[PDB]
Amino acid sequence: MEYRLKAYYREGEKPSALRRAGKLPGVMYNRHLNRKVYVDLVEFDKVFRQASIHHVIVLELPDGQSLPTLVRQVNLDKRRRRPEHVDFFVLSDEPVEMYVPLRFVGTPAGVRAGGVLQEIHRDILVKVSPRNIPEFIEVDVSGLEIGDSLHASDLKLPPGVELAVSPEETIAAVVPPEDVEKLAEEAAAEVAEPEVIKKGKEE
Amino acid sequence: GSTRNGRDSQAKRLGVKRYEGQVVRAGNILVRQRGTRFKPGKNVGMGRDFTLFALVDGVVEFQDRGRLGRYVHVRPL
Amino acid sequence: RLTAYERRKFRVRNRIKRTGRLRLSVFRSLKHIYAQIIDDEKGVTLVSASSLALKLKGNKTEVARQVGRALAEKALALGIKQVAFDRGPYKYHGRVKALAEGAREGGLEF
Amino acid sequence: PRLKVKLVKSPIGYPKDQKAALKALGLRRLQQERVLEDTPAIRGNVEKVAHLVRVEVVE
Amino acid sequence: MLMPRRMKYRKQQRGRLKGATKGGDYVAFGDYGLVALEPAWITAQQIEAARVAMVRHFRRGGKIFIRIFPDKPYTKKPLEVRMGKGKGNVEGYVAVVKPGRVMFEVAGVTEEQAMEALRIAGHKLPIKTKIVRRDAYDEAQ
RNA sequence: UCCCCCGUGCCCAUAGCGGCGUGGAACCACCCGUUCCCAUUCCGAACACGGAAGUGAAACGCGCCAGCGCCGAUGGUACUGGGCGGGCGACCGCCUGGGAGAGUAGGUCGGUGCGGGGGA
RNA sequence: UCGAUCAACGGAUAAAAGUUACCCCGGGGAUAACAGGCUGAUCUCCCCCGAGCGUCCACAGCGGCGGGGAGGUUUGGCACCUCGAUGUCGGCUCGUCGCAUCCUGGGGCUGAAGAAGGUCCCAAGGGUUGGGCUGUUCGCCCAUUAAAGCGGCACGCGAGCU
RNA sequence: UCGCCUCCUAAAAGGUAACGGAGGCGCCCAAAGGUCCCCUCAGGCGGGACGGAAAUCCGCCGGAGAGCGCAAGGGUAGAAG
RNA sequence: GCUGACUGGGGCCUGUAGAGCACUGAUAGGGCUAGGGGGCCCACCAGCCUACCAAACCCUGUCAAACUCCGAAGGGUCCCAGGUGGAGCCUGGGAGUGAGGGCGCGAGCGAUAACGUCCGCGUCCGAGCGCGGGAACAACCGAGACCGCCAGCUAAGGCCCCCAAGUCUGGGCUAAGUGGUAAAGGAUGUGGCGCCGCGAAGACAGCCAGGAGGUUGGCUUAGAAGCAGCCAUCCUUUAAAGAGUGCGUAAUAGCUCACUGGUCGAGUGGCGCCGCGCCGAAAAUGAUCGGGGCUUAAGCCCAGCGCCGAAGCUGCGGGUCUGG
Ligand SMILES: C[C@H]1O[C@H](O[C@H]2CC[C@H](n3ccc(NC(=O)c4ccc(NC(=O)[C@@](C)(N)CO)cc4)nc3=O)O[C@@H]2C)[C@H](O)[C@@H](O)[C@@H]1N(C)C
Ligand SMILES: NC(=[NH2+])NCCC[C@H](N)C(=O)O
Ligand SMILES: [Mg+2]
Ligand SMILES: [Mg+2]
Ligand SMILES: [Mg+2]
Ligand SMILES: [Mg+2]
Ligand SMILES: [Mg+2]
Ligand SMILES: [Mg+2]
Ligand SMILES: [Mg+2]
Ligand SMILES: [Mg+2]
Ligand SMILES: [Mg+2]
Ligand SMILES: [Mg+2]
Ligand SMILES: [Mg+2]
Ligand SMILES: [Mg+2]
Ligand SMILES: [Mg+2]
Ligand SMILES: [Mg+2]
Ligand SMILES: [Mg+2]
Ligand SMILES: [Mg+2]
Ligand SMILES: [Mg+2]
Ligand SMILES: [Mg+2]
Ligand SMILES: [Mg+2]
Ligand SMILES: [Mg+2]
Ligand SMILES: [Mg+2]
Ligand SMILES: [Mg+2]
Ligand SMILES: [Mg+2]
Ligand SMILES: [Mg+2]
Ligand SMILES: [Mg+2]
Ligand SMILES: [Mg+2]
Ligand SMILES: [Mg+2]
Ligand SMILES: [Mg+2]
Ligand SMILES: [Mg+2]
Ligand SMILES: [Mg+2]
Ligand SMILES: [Mg+2]
Ligand SMILES: [Mg+2]
Ligand SMILES: [Mg+2]
Ligand SMILES: [Mg+2]
Ligand SMILES: [Mg+2]
Ligand SMILES: [Mg+2]
Ligand SMILES: [Mg+2]
Ligand SMILES: [Mg+2]
Ligand SMILES: [Mg+2]
Ligand SMILES: [Mg+2]
Ligand SMILES: [Mg+2]
Ligand SMILES: [Mg+2]
Ligand SMILES: [Mg+2]
Ligand SMILES: [Mg+2]
Ligand SMILES: [Mg+2]
Ligand SMILES: [Mg+2]
Ligand SMILES: [Mg+2]
Ligand SMILES: [Mg+2]
Ligand SMILES: [Mg+2]
Ligand SMILES: [Mg+2]
Ligand SMILES: [Mg+2]
Ligand SMILES: [Mg+2]
Ligand SMILES: [Mg+2]
Ligand SMILES: [Mg+2]
Ligand SMILES: [Mg+2]
Ligand SMILES: [Mg+2]
Ligand SMILES: [Mg+2]
Ligand SMILES: [Mg+2]
Ligand SMILES: [Mg+2]
Ligand SMILES: [Mg+2]
Ligand SMILES: [Mg+2]
Ligand SMILES: [Mg+2]
Ligand SMILES: [Mg+2]
Ligand SMILES: [Mg+2]
Ligand SMILES: [Mg+2]
Ligand SMILES: [Mg+2]
Ligand SMILES: [Mg+2]
Ligand SMILES: [Mg+2]
Ligand SMILES: [Mg+2]
Ligand SMILES: [Mg+2]
Ligand SMILES: [Mg+2]
Ligand SMILES: [Mg+2]
Ligand SMILES: [Mg+2]
Ligand SMILES: [Mg+2]
Ligand SMILES: [Mg+2]
Ligand SMILES: [Mg+2]
Ligand SMILES: [Mg+2]
Ligand SMILES: [Mg+2]
Ligand SMILES: [Mg+2]
Ligand SMILES: [Mg+2]
Ligand SMILES: [Mg+2]
Ligand SMILES: [Mg+2]
Ligand SMILES: [Mg+2]
Ligand SMILES: [Mg+2]
Ligand SMILES: [Mg+2]
Ligand SMILES: [Mg+2]
Ligand SMILES: [Mg+2]
Ligand SMILES: [Mg+2]
Ligand SMILES: [Mg+2]
Ligand SMILES: [Mg+2]
Ligand SMILES: [Mg+2]
Ligand SMILES: [Mg+2]
Ligand SMILES: [Mg+2]
Ligand SMILES: [Mg+2]
Ligand SMILES: [Mg+2]
Ligand SMILES: [Mg+2]
Ligand SMILES: [Mg+2]
Ligand SMILES: [Mg+2]
Ligand SMILES: [Mg+2]
Ligand SMILES: [Mg+2]
Ligand SMILES: [Mg+2]
Ligand SMILES: [Mg+2]
Ligand SMILES: [Mg+2]
Ligand SMILES: [Mg+2]
Ligand SMILES: [Mg+2]
Ligand SMILES: [Mg+2]
Ligand SMILES: [Mg+2]
Ligand SMILES: [Mg+2]
Ligand SMILES: [Mg+2]
Ligand SMILES: [Mg+2]
Ligand SMILES: [Mg+2]
Ligand SMILES: [Mg+2]
Ligand SMILES: [Mg+2]
Ligand SMILES: [Mg+2]
Ligand SMILES: [Mg+2]
Ligand SMILES: [Mg+2]
Ligand SMILES: [Mg+2]
Ligand SMILES: [Mg+2]
Ligand SMILES: [Mg+2]
Ligand SMILES: [Mg+2]
Ligand SMILES: [Mg+2]
Ligand SMILES: [Mg+2]
Ligand SMILES: [Mg+2]
Ligand SMILES: [Mg+2]
Ligand SMILES: [Mg+2]
Ligand SMILES: [Mg+2]
Ligand SMILES: [Mg+2]
Ligand SMILES: [Mg+2]
Ligand SMILES: [Mg+2]
Ligand SMILES: [Mg+2]
Ligand SMILES: [Mg+2]
Ligand SMILES: [Mg+2]
Ligand SMILES: [Mg+2]
Ligand SMILES: [Mg+2]
Ligand SMILES: [Mg+2]
Ligand SMILES: [Mg+2]
Ligand SMILES: [Mg+2]
Ligand SMILES: [Mg+2]
Ligand SMILES: [Mg+2]
Ligand SMILES: [Mg+2]
Ligand SMILES: [Mg+2]
Ligand SMILES: [Mg+2]
Ligand SMILES: [Mg+2]
Ligand SMILES: [Mg+2]
Ligand SMILES: [Mg+2]
Ligand SMILES: [Mg+2]
Ligand SMILES: [Mg+2]
Ligand SMILES: [Mg+2]
Ligand SMILES: [Mg+2]
Ligand SMILES: [Mg+2]
Ligand SMILES: [Mg+2]
Ligand SMILES: [Mg+2]
Ligand SMILES: [Mg+2]
Ligand SMILES: [Mg+2]
Ligand SMILES: [Mg+2]
Ligand SMILES: [Mg+2]
Ligand SMILES: [Mg+2]
Ligand SMILES: [Mg+2]
Ligand SMILES: [Mg+2]
Ligand SMILES: [Mg+2]
Ligand SMILES: [Mg+2]
Ligand SMILES: [Mg+2]
Ligand SMILES: [Mg+2]
Ligand SMILES: [Mg+2]
Ligand SMILES: [Mg+2]
Ligand SMILES: [Mg+2]
Ligand SMILES: [Mg+2]
Ligand SMILES: [Mg+2]
Ligand SMILES: [Mg+2]
Ligand SMILES: [Mg+2]
Ligand SMILES: [Mg+2]
Ligand SMILES: [Mg+2]
Ligand SMILES: [Mg+2]
Ligand SMILES: [Mg+2]
Ligand SMILES: [Mg+2]
Ligand SMILES: [Mg+2]
C-alpha cells in the first residue's frame, strides 16, 4: 500500500537529545538530493510496523514537499533493541530494487504430517517501477512434503516485477518437528572429545 | 602436574629506524624487517637480511606504490 | 596473468634501472627495429633512431647497425656518452645485438 | 589578545606530564593568576589542564 | 551437548564481557526468540537445558533455533591444588553471551506455546531474558 | 594545438574477468621458409636469421553493455585520548575533542608524461 | 685452525655423591606445619524453574536437565600480624552464646478417620541418661528415654588438671 | 625447567613478567653457493593404452592459496620458485 | 647556554579497541550435490525411492590471544616555533636502591575467588603515620606543612542536637526506618507515562436465568461421558451455547468461563516501559544508621541562594637560601 508521515529537517541539532526529545534522526537521499531529517519516533513506529521496507511512504515535509520514498535501512540500539536512525530512499519514477513481501498460501502436506513450514524468506528482492509495486506475492505451499523446499525459480511473477536474485535461491521449506522421542537417545549421546589440530612436525 | 611450553626468543627490535623527512648519512639504517615489508627505493640499499640502509647523505622518504609495495628513498641534498 | 613476454621484459629492465644510468630501449618488429634512449627519472625520451623513420632497406641485421650508428651519432651531439643497453624481451643476438654493435661504433659507451 | 590563567584545582594526583603543563604556563601555586599571550602553543597546555584551571580572555 | 569437533588451540584465554552484543540482536529465522539482557559465559550444559525444556513443552512439533554456540574452552585447575604448575585442564565449554543477543528462536507453534517454553528456557539461564516477537525492524536487517 | 598506431614511463583494479562490436593504407601481430647466426632436457610452439604471397581468424589496439570483481559517500552507531559520575560485582552512564567497520544511495569497462610513424 | 651436552649453556675446581630423630650456630613470620585473618573452589543448609513419580491428580511426600544465594563448623587457596615461641589431638572441670530445633509448647497442609507418623512455619525457657569397643573426635552396639540435636567461643577451656 | 629461534599474551614504535598458551635448534648444502640465459604453481572441469581419489601428456580457468631442505613468522613469480 | 619535560603545525612508522569473514580454523539451520548406512529389486551389471550419518560449493546467522579485505582514538620519532625551569647536554667525585605496597584502567594466571599472583601506563603511601573530609583507618576525596596572629576567602565534606554553618526556598517520590549492606525470582505495594479489547448495537462486579441435542462422540487403549496424547473441528433446536476455559471426579455429576434473554446505569478486564519501595533475608559476648534522634524528613531524584569548613589562597610581621 502507501502510508504517510510528517518529516522535519535538521542540522546542528544533536542526535543525543533528539531521540530523548522523542524524535528519530534520519536522512533523505537519492542520486539527486541528500538532506537530514528526523521523525516523531512514535509516529513513524506506527507506520513501519505496517510498512516495513515493503510499502511506500511519502514524507510530509514542512517546506511543503511530499516525496515518495522507501526505507532502505534502519539502525537499532543493539543493547536496548530499539531504532536509532532510519534511511528514507527518495523513490523516483525510475526502476528500483526493493523487497516485495510473500504470503505462502496453502497448507503444506508436511504440516498435516507433523512438520513445520520454515518461512525462510518472508519477502523477496525485486527490481520494479514504484508505480508498479505489487502488494504481495502468492505462492502455493500445499504440495510440500518433509522435507521439500521451494525457490525463487518456482515463483510466478506478476507484470513489471523482475527478480534481483539467483533463482537457485531458496525461500521456504518443510522440516521435521521437535520430537521428544529423539531426546532420551540424545541423552546417552557419546561425542568423542574434540580433536586438536596437530602442529609442527605432527601433521 | 607440570608444563611443556614456557620458552621464547629475545625480541629482535624490528621496525623502521629512520622515518620520512628525517636526515641521515651514508650507511645509516632505515628499516629493520623480516621479508621485504619495505623495498630499497632510490639511494637506498638492502642487505642479506632485508635491511635497508641509506647510500648517500640525503633525506629519507617513503612511497606506497600500491601493489608494487612500499619503498623508502633517499633524495640527496 | 602475465605472459613470459611480459615477465622477461620486466626483470631484464627493473634490473637495468637499479644502475640509474640512461637506458637504451630497443624494439624489434617483423619489419623494422626502433631505438629510443630514455631517462626513467624524468619520464622523458631524448634521441630517437629507427629503420622506419630512416627509410632503411632489407637486411634487418645490416639495418640494425645503421640505426645503431645513427642513434649514437645523434646522441653524442647531445653530450650523451655512457648509457645502459635494454635488450627487452630480446636476447642479445643479431638484429638486437648488431644494433648495439653499431651504436658502440657511433660513440656511445657500453 | 591575552589569557589570564588561574590554578584552581590541585595537580596532586594527576600524571607527571600535566604537572609539566602547569610548569610551562608558569603556574606553580594554587589561586596563582598568570596572564599569557594567546598563541596556539600556550593555548595548548592551558587546555590540557582546564579541568584544573579557570580561564578568562583579557585585553 | 554442544562443543566443536576440531580445534586449532586447546586453551583460550578469558577475554572480557564488555560492550553490547557484537551481533545477533535481531530475529533472523523463527517467529519468537529469547534475548540476552546481561553478559555471561553460557555453558553447553545450560544451552542443552533450555533446548530440551522447549522441545518437551512442544511435546511433538515446533522448531527451535540455537543462535549461540559454546566455542570457548573453559579451563580449571584440578582440586585442592596450589597455584602454578601450568594452566588448568578443560572441564566443559561455554558460549559467551552479551546483552541484546538473540540466543534462541522458535517457529511452527502457537503464541502461548512459544511464550511459555521460552519463559521456561529462560529460567535455565544464569542471566535475565526478554521474550521478543519478529518486528519489521528485524526484517529490514 | 586534434584524431589512429608502434615504443616507453606514472597513478596502482573507478584501470580486471567476461559478453559484443570494429580496425589492416600505415604500423603491429599471426604470416612464408628453416639456406645462414642462433636455438628445443622432443618439437623453428618458444628464442633466432632471411623474407613479404595472404589474413586481421588468434593475439594486441579503439570503442558500447553494470552479470562478477574493484571503488564507495552522507547520516547514524561501536570504539576511544582527556575530564567527571554509578554499582558490592560482571559491569553501566554524562561532558569536551577524534571517530570507524559492515551496510545504504551511488561511481567504475581508466586518466595523464615524453620521443617516434602517418593523417587533417 | 683444532680440542666445550664447560647444556646448571656469562661458562667457581684440572678433578667430587649421600645421611643426620645425636645434631649445632647465625637469621626469617622475607617461608610451611597450629590458630586467626582475606577468599568461599570444596563443605553444610536454603531457594528459582517444574520435566517426571505418587491407581487418578506437577507441588501430601518428592523435583530430571539447569539457575541464583546465604553461612564460615570441613578439605584447601593466598602467606597478612606472630618462628629474641600464639604449646596443636581426645578427655575431665566450667561454662556461655547461635538457631539451620533432638525434646517439651503453639500452628497450617496432609494420601490428617482415630492413635501414631510425614512436611513446612513460630519459639533458644528448661532439658538433651547410663554403659561395652577404641587415644580417639566421629561412628557402631547394649539398656533406656519426653528426647538422647548440630554447631561458635584460637576445631572454647594445659600460668586450671590430666 | 635452565642457552638459542618463531607466534601470541604485548594494551596499533621499541621493550615488557609469571612453573601463562602453542611448536622448534644443537643440523645441514660442494650445491641447496656465485653469475648469465630461459621457464612459472598448486587447484578446479573435460580429454587419453596398460594406468588407479593423486605417476606423466593435451585443453580452458587459475595474482597465488604451490614452492622455497627442517618449527613458526614475515617475505616472495616484476623471484627469493 | 635554550637544546629540557609539556604544548601548536606538519610529514612519516604501527595493526590494538571496535568490527569484519577475503585468507586459517570453529559454527546451528536450510539448499545443492561425489561418497556410504538401510528399503524394494536383483549376481547377469546395471537401476529407484529416502523425515539416514554426511565432503566440496552457495545462502541466512555467528565465533577466535596465537584468523584479518578493513582499521581508529592514541603512541612513537624527525624539522620549525613557544618554553629561563632545583629544565637539559658534557666531564668528574660521593652515594644510597637493586624485599615495595594500595588505587585506577588494559591483560594473563586464578574460580569473569583472595588485603592472591605476574607484567604494562599512571597515581599515591613508601619518604606526606603532618593538616581537612571519610565515625574511627599508610595509600578513596581535598591539599604539597619555613615560623608567629584571639584577621579574611575557599577545596573535598557538610549546616536538627553531640559538632562549626539552613530545622533555607521551590516541585516531585518514599510509609518500608527503605534510607541504615546481598541474587535469581515472586507479588492486585505505591506513583507517573503509554497499548491494545469490551462498553450505553448497555459492558466488567454482582445480580437474575440460560448454557442446550447427535454426544457416555472418534485414533483409543485397561475409567477416557466438553476438561489423561493425536493425524479432528461436523450437524440440530436456536435468543444464544467451544463437540469446551477452568474447578471439580476413581471414573458419573455439580460449579462457572467463553455464550444470549432480564437487572440495574458507567466505565471495566488484560498487556509492556520507567521511578521508589515489599518479601526473598538464618550465627554464634550487647545492641545501634558513628550516637541521639528524623517521616510534606534530619531519607532519595531534579533546580536554586547563603553560610560553616584545611597547615591550600589572601592579609601583616619575621628567617634563610638563590636570582635581579
Ligand atoms: C619425620 C621427620 O620429621 C621431621 O622432618 C620433617 C618435618 C616436616 C617436613 N615437611 C613435611 C610435609 C610437607 N608438606 C607436604 O607433605 C605437603 C602436603 C600436602 C600439600 N598439599 C597441597 O599442595 C594441596 C592441598 N594444594 C593439594 O595439592 C603440600 C605439601 N612439607 C615439609 O617440609 O618434612 C621433614 C622431613 C624431623 O626433623 C626429621 O628428623 C624426621 N625424619 C626425617 C627422621
Ligand atoms: N572519550 C572517551 N575516551 N570516552 C570513553 C568513554 C568510556 C565509557 N566507559 C563509555 O562507554 O562511554
Ligand atoms: Mg505499499
Ligand atoms: Mg516504542
Ligand atoms: Mg613438561
Ligand atoms: Mg612462555
Ligand atoms: Mg617468560
Ligand atoms: Mg620474552
Ligand atoms: Mg619474541
Ligand atoms: Mg617501522
Ligand atoms: Mg648484498
Ligand atoms: Mg641471503
Ligand atoms: Mg610525500
Ligand atoms: Mg626522491
Ligand atoms: Mg612522470
Ligand atoms: Mg587535584
Ligand atoms: Mg587529587
Ligand atoms: Mg603525551
Ligand atoms: Mg600551592
Ligand atoms: Mg573557579
Ligand atoms: Mg572478543
Ligand atoms: Mg559460568
Ligand atoms: Mg585456570
Ligand atoms: Mg599455572
Ligand atoms: Mg563447565
Ligand atoms: Mg555474543
Ligand atoms: Mg534465569
Ligand atoms: Mg548484517
Ligand atoms: Mg570483424
Ligand atoms: Mg576485440
Ligand atoms: Mg587489405
Ligand atoms: Mg647460404
Ligand atoms: Mg617457424
Ligand atoms: Mg616471434
Ligand atoms: Mg614474402
Ligand atoms: Mg580480432
Ligand atoms: Mg605480444
Ligand atoms: Mg599503449
Ligand atoms: Mg555507464
Ligand atoms: Mg563500505
Ligand atoms: Mg561519518
Ligand atoms: Mg577515560
Ligand atoms: Mg567505585
Ligand atoms: Mg558508551
Ligand atoms: Mg565531535
Ligand atoms: Mg565506511
Ligand atoms: Mg569494469
Ligand atoms: Mg607527432
Ligand atoms: Mg678442553
Ligand atoms: Mg633440552
Ligand atoms: Mg649457572
Ligand atoms: Mg658445572
Ligand atoms: Mg645471554
Ligand atoms: Mg674450569
Ligand atoms: Mg660439580
Ligand atoms: Mg634416628
Ligand atoms: Mg628414625
Ligand atoms: Mg619414637
Ligand atoms: Mg648425647
Ligand atoms: Mg643412634
Ligand atoms: Mg653435636
Ligand atoms: Mg633438622
Ligand atoms: Mg638456634
Ligand atoms: Mg624468599
Ligand atoms: Mg613482610
Ligand atoms: Mg617455612
Ligand atoms: Mg598451620
Ligand atoms: Mg589442618
Ligand atoms: Mg590454637
Ligand atoms: Mg592456616
Ligand atoms: Mg578472630
Ligand atoms: Mg595471631
Ligand atoms: Mg574474612
Ligand atoms: Mg560468603
Ligand atoms: Mg534462601
Ligand atoms: Mg501418573
Ligand atoms: Mg493432588
Ligand atoms: Mg519445592
Ligand atoms: Mg536437583
Ligand atoms: Mg553457582
Ligand atoms: Mg581456613
Ligand atoms: Mg608472611
Ligand atoms: Mg614473636
Ligand atoms: Mg611462631
Ligand atoms: Mg612468650
Ligand atoms: Mg614475644
Ligand atoms: Mg526457624
Ligand atoms: Mg514442637
Ligand atoms: Mg508438637
Ligand atoms: Mg491414615
Ligand atoms: Mg488412621
Ligand atoms: Mg493425630
Ligand atoms: Mg505437624
Ligand atoms: Mg532453648
Ligand atoms: Mg540447650
Ligand atoms: Mg553415650
Ligand atoms: Mg571398660
Ligand atoms: Mg572411627
Ligand atoms: Mg562396622
Ligand atoms: Mg516406651
Ligand atoms: Mg514425639
Ligand atoms: Mg580447624
Ligand atoms: Mg581439624
Ligand atoms: Mg584446641
Ligand atoms: Mg585445651
Ligand atoms: Mg599441663
Ligand atoms: Mg591439651
Ligand atoms: Mg610489539
Ligand atoms: Mg604498545
Ligand atoms: Mg631502543
Ligand atoms: Mg618451569
Ligand atoms: Mg622443547
Ligand atoms: Mg635454502
Ligand atoms: Mg585407464
Ligand atoms: Mg607458501
Ligand atoms: Mg620441520
Ligand atoms: Mg599476512
Ligand atoms: Mg628558545
Ligand atoms: Mg627537542
Ligand atoms: Mg622536543
Ligand atoms: Mg616524550
Ligand atoms: Mg607534540
Ligand atoms: Mg574483539
Ligand atoms: Mg571465515
Ligand atoms: Mg555475508
Ligand atoms: Mg572476536
Ligand atoms: Mg592478537
Ligand atoms: Mg586479533
Ligand atoms: Mg576500505
Ligand atoms: Mg594516527
Ligand atoms: Mg623553540
Ligand atoms: Mg640554572
Ligand atoms: Mg631536581
Ligand atoms: Mg632532576
Ligand atoms: Mg655522578
Ligand atoms: Mg638482588
Ligand atoms: Mg617483597
Ligand atoms: Mg634489604
Ligand atoms: Mg626484586
Ligand atoms: Mg612489582
Ligand atoms: Mg602484593
Ligand atoms: Mg587500607
Ligand atoms: Mg589495582
Ligand atoms: Mg571510572
Ligand atoms: Mg576497567
Ligand atoms: Mg584489571
Ligand atoms: Mg596475558
Ligand atoms: Mg577462568
Ligand atoms: Mg583484587
Ligand atoms: Mg607477594
Ligand atoms: Mg615481585
Ligand atoms: Mg624503605
Ligand atoms: Mg597524601
Ligand atoms: Mg609525593
Ligand atoms: Mg594521608
Ligand atoms: Mg603521624
Ligand atoms: Mg604515630
Ligand atoms: Mg587524614
Ligand atoms: Mg580522620
Ligand atoms: Mg571527625
Ligand atoms: Mg601543588
Ligand atoms: Mg566566607
Ligand atoms: Mg553528619
Ligand atoms: Mg553525644
Ligand atoms: Mg525544609
Ligand atoms: Mg519539598
Ligand atoms: Mg520488613
Ligand atoms: Mg537497618
Ligand atoms: Mg525481577
Ligand atoms: Mg528485584
Ligand atoms: Mg506489582
Ligand atoms: Mg472482579
Ligand atoms: Mg476423545
Ligand atoms: Mg528483604
Ligand atoms: Mg550480637
Ligand atoms: Mg603556605
Ligand atoms: Mg610575606
Ligand atoms: Mg633554595
| Best residue for ligand 1 mutational test, from E77, E79, E81 (most atoms within 8 Å of Cβ) | E81
Q: Residues with beta carbon inside 6 Å of ligand 1? A: E 80-82
Min distance E46 CA to chain B CA atoms (Å) = 30
Does residue E39 lie in a domain region?
yes
Experimental method of this PDB entry: X-ray
Is A194 within 8 Å of E6 when comparing Cβ atoms?
Answer: yes
Q: List the domain range (segments joined by +) for residue E133.
A: 29-137
Does residue E18 lie in a domain region?
no
- The string of DSSP letters for A110-144 reads HHHHT-EE----SEEEEEE-GGG--S--EEE-TT-
- The string of DSSP letters for D1-46 reads -EEEEEE-S--TTS-HHHHHHHHHHT--SSS-EEEEE--TTHHHHH
Q: How many domains would you assign to chain E?
A: 1
Nearest nucleotide relative to C53: CA against C1': F117
* A185 burial level (CB within 10 Å; 0-12, 13-18, 19+): exposed
- Judge contact between A80 and A111, C-beta under 8 A: no
E/A Cβ contact: 3+ pairs below 8 Å: yes
Sign of the Cα torsion C104, C65, C92, C78 reads positive
d(CA D32, CA D35): 10
d(CA A132, CA A112): 37
Select from E64, E66, E67, E139 the least CA-distant residue to E109.
Answer: E64
Residues with CB under 5 A from ligand 3 (ion): A 1, 55-56
Is B3 within 8 Å of E78 when comparing Cβ atoms?
Answer: no
Does residue E19 lie in a domain region?
no
Distances (CA, A) of C69 to A166, B49, B55, C76: 65, 44, 36, 11
Nearest nucleotide relative to A180: CA against C1': G51
**What is the CATH number for E40?**
3.90.1170.10
The answer to whether residue E18 neighbours chain A at the CB level (below 8 Å) is no
d(CA C79, CA C70): 15
Angle at C104 between CA C100 and CA C107, to 5 degrees: 140
Angle at A185 between CA A179 and CA A186, to 5 degrees: 75
Neighbours of chain A (3+ CB pairs under 8 A): E
Those nucleotides of strand H lying less than 7 Å from any protein Cβ are 1-10, 13-16, 18-24, 37-40, 62-64, 70-80
Does residue E8 lie in a domain region?
no
- Judge contact between B70 and B36, C-beta under 8 A: no
What lies within 8 Å, CB to CB, of C42 at 6+ separation is none
User: Pseudo-torsion of CA C45, C47, C50, C53, nearest 10°?
Assistant: 100
The resolution of the experimental structure, rounded to one decimal in Å, is 3.1
| C-alpha C8: how far from chain center | 16
E21, E56, E137: which to substitute to probe chain A, counting the most A Cβ within 10 Å? Answer: E137
What lies within 8 Å, CB to CB, of C101 at 6+ separation is C65, C68
The secondary structure of residue E86, as a DSSP letter, is S
d(CA B52, CA B31): 5
For residue B6, the CA-to-ligand 151 centroid distance in Å is 19
Nearest nucleotide relative to E126: CA against C1': G67
d(CA B18, CA B76): 15
Does residue E20 lie in a domain region?
no
| C-alpha D30: how far from chain center | 11
Nearest nucleotide relative to A85: CA against C1': F76
Those nucleotides of strand I lying less than 7 Å from any protein Cβ are 4-14, 18-20, 24-32, 51, 58-67, 76-79, 81-86, 106-114, 116-117, 122-124, 141-144, 155, 184-185, 229-231, 273, 312-314
- Judge contact between C65 and C102, C-beta under 8 A: yes
Peptide bond into E84 cis (omega under 30): no
Q: Which residue has the cell 543477543?
A: E101
Select from E61, E66, E121, E107 the least CA-distant residue to A178.
Answer: E61
Min distance B6 CA to chain E CA atoms (Å) = 9
Does residue E110 lie in a domain region?
yes
- Judge contact between E50 and E124, C-beta under 8 A: yes
Helices (H), E73-110: none
- The x, y and z cell numbers of residue A6, run together, are 510528517
What lies within 8 Å, CB to CB, of A139 at 6+ separation is A102, A103, A104, A105, A150, A154, A155, A156, A171, A172
Give the other-Cβ count within 10 Å of A66's Cβ: 12
Start-to-end CA distance of chain E, whole Å, equals: 31
- The x, y and z cell numbers of residue A93, run together, are 519514477
Interface of E with A in 79-118 (CB under 8 A): 99-100, 107-108
The secondary structure of residue C78, as a DSSP letter, is T
* E71 burial level (CB within 10 Å; 0-12, 13-18, 19+): middle
Residue B1: list chain E partners with CB under 8 A: 78, 81, 85-86
H or E segment and range at residue C36? strand C33-39
Those nucleotides of strand G lying less than 7 Å from any protein Cβ are 41-42, 48-52, 64-68, 75-79
Query: With left for phi above 0 and alpha for psi between -120 and 50, is residue B15 left, alpha or beta?
Result: left
Residue C85: HSE in the Cβ half-sphere, 13 Å Cα cutoff: 20
Residue E128: HSE in the Cβ half-sphere, 13 Å Cα cutoff: 4
Amino acid at A75: N
The answer to whether residue B3 neighbours chain E at the CB level (below 8 Å) is yes
For residue B41, the CA-to-ligand 1 centroid distance in Å is 69
Does residue E21 lie in a domain region?
no
Does residue E127 lie in a domain region?
yes
Distances (CA, A) of C71 to A113, C50, C76, C96, C97: 91, 8, 9, 14, 14
